[PDB]
Ligand binder design. Sequence first.
Ligand code: JW2
Length: 164
Amino acid sequence: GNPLVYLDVDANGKPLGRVVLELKADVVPKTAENFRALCTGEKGFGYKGSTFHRVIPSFMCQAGDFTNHNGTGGKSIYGSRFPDENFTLKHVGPGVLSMANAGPNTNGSQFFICTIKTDWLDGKHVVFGHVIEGMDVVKKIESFGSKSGRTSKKIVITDCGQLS
Ligand SMILES: O=C(NCc1ccccn1)C(=O)NC1CCCC1
């Protein structure tokens, strides 16, 4: 079956809890594999210790820049960037997991979890999973965002990995 991965998140050094995500490897195997390996850190790099650097209430929580920690960086397990696999899955509502990018075919490691339906991102951002458990954790993260995306608390992925 599809991988189940986790993110344990702190806000200002205190645990918020765990976000569990299903990666739709059946639809986007290459995008799901990249995220799965960055969670385990099995390639010698990944999300562990990185932050949610851009959070916009009533929109989304963005993370994954483990190289520059500011939204300009990140890298995939394949190389610096990889193509848009497909746009089959849509940004249907809260809990959608999707790839951040800098235009077509620029997927790296940055991703976002939506807190609303974001239909304008369909056909532009590759959706590759959804929140199974921990939407309460996502709402907490979201509450520490702002209109500019600047976070009011330091949001850190302390631990991450694969459940199944
Ligand atoms: O912030 C985003 N892209 C900039 C970027 C991403 C990687 C490398 C360099 N520059 C980006 O796609 N955010 C998504 C979250 C909601 C709007 C779309």
